[PDB]
Amino acid sequence: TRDQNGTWEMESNENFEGWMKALDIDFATRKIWVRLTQTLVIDQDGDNFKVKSTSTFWNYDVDFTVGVEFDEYTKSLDNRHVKALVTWEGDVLVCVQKGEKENRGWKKWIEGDKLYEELTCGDQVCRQVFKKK
Template identity: 55%
Template structure:
């Protein structure tokens, strides 16, 4: 059984976020704002349903999904695209493959050394974020 990702997590590092956003086609103005934000992740599990909230002072984004079940996702406030997403466990990593206009798009969450790690990837760009648990 993978380590629980559930809890509230505050960002402590954010590497290559601008490159990732550029790959998504996000405007320079929005990238400039987003680079200044300190994100908070709230991950909840209720039965076989997961809820992942990404919170900031500028915009919030929430997704809800079941493992191994494809779902439609509208990335409102991010790159505003309609995509298909499928989340699976790969070992101890919760991974998401996203299909749509952009190639090789998705993310992976996992816990290592009491920190939540997130890799976001799109068209060869990889953003690495690390979060600490909010006590």
Template identity: 45%
Template sequence: MSKPNYTGIYHMVSQENFEEYLAALDVNYALRKVVCILKPSKHIEHNLNSGEMKIKTVTTFRNFDMDFTLGQEFTEDLGPVDGRKCQTTVNWDGDKLVCEQRGEKEGRGWTHWLEGNLLHLEMRVQDVTAKQVFKKAE
């Protein structure tokens, strides 16, 4: 089975349970309210041959960059302001990208998968799951 190429620009079309997810991450109330009204886009560069990926989440509030190689653990900067970091590994699970994060919160990670022109993102921490759906730009 060939792996899908995630390269593209995707704009958020929906989200579920995101405030609860942020609360489980101990994000303060005011910041949760701000973050939940943002409509991020994801700019993804994916090299299928090398496994290198760049995921840039762009908002009017703040941008987040994540550069990694599939299957290789790296230190992820979770909170540039307060210095939170964790050890992160992203691997294939079939045609889905699955991220496991260690060191910040138990059971934290995410899964990305494509269905047509939709990019799905399921985020989890402990027993809380949130979902966002993005549509690929034409």
């Protein structure tokens, strides 16, 4: 099940703060962001993805083509330069962001009407579940 299209409403968020600490999010912003419910909007056609991660206090959008590396600035998250690559491992969509932090990226997959993802950085893993609106 590779079809990740949808507007995805958060149902569960685990260890979001540990992931943010690995990224060194400034502590005041981090303490606010840990409170916030996340929404993911995913538009997917062929290899082409347009993704928007939002809450009441952040906006983070990224467009990418599966299989095509891209230089990326992480902008509104942690303002770092990485070399990003998104690929399929079966029906798990896997992003690796090569740069300063180790083990950085995410894994995203579908279970029925739910979207599951892991956000990774350093030794930290944040686990999230969303439901298709």
